[PDB]
Design a protein around this nucleic acid. Structure first.
Ligand code: CA
Ligand code: CA
Ligand code: CA
Length: 149
RNA sequence: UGGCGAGUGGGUGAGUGAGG
DNA sequence: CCTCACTCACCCACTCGCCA
């Protein structure tokens, strides 16, 4: 009934001068939907993690899939979409310190995708998961090595 | 009061740069 | 496995500064 997918977002030189952010998605051994692309827009790891998910819900919708089990090591991504967003719409998208929520654009994009979607968000220990997370990371790393389109 | 920018030190986890 | 240096961003909350 459900489908299991592994996503990762990386970023070479995160917070440095020339950051390169990539995303990776893993469905199955040699699954043709396995992808590792350079992330357009601002080059951060947090944006890569959110949009690495985003691409998974994107691809699942093109497969008439609505029940998803989504794996990512980003507690930022998981806690934001499952918790913080509801309070953010209520307080005008303001962090605990009163400043604007930086990745609002990415979280709005993510939730817009979760509509009509039944996703079970699951966390992976970044250094203790099995080959699903390990590979998905490798797709992200090699995706950040590419140029944009 | 509104706007803006730095911190403080606990939590969540992430992504890195340089070396053995 | 070991060592230095970071940022990305949020939760909890109380402090400095800047502008009307
Ligand atoms: Ca984008
Ligand atoms: Ca104030
Ligand atoms: Ca850490």
């Amino acid at each position: 009934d459900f489908v299991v997918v592994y996503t990762d977002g990386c970023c070479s030189s995160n917070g440095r001068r020339r950051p390169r952010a990539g995303i990776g998605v893993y469905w199955g051994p040699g699954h043709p939907l396995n992808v590792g692309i350079r992330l357009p827009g601002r080059q951060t790891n947090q944006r890569a993690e959110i949009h690495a998910a985003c691409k998974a819900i994107e691809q699942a919708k093109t497969q008439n899939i609505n029940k998803l089990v989504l794996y990512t090591n980003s507690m930022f991504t998981i806690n934001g979409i499952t918790n913080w967003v509801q309070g953010w719409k209520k307080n005008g998208w303001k962090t605990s310190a009163g400043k604007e929520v930086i990745n609002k654009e990415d979280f709005v994009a993510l939730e817009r995708l979760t509509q009509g979607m039944d996703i079970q968000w699951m966390h992976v220990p970044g250094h203790s998961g099995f080959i699903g997370n390990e590979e998905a990371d490798r797709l992200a790393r090699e995706g950040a090595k590419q140029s944009e389109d």
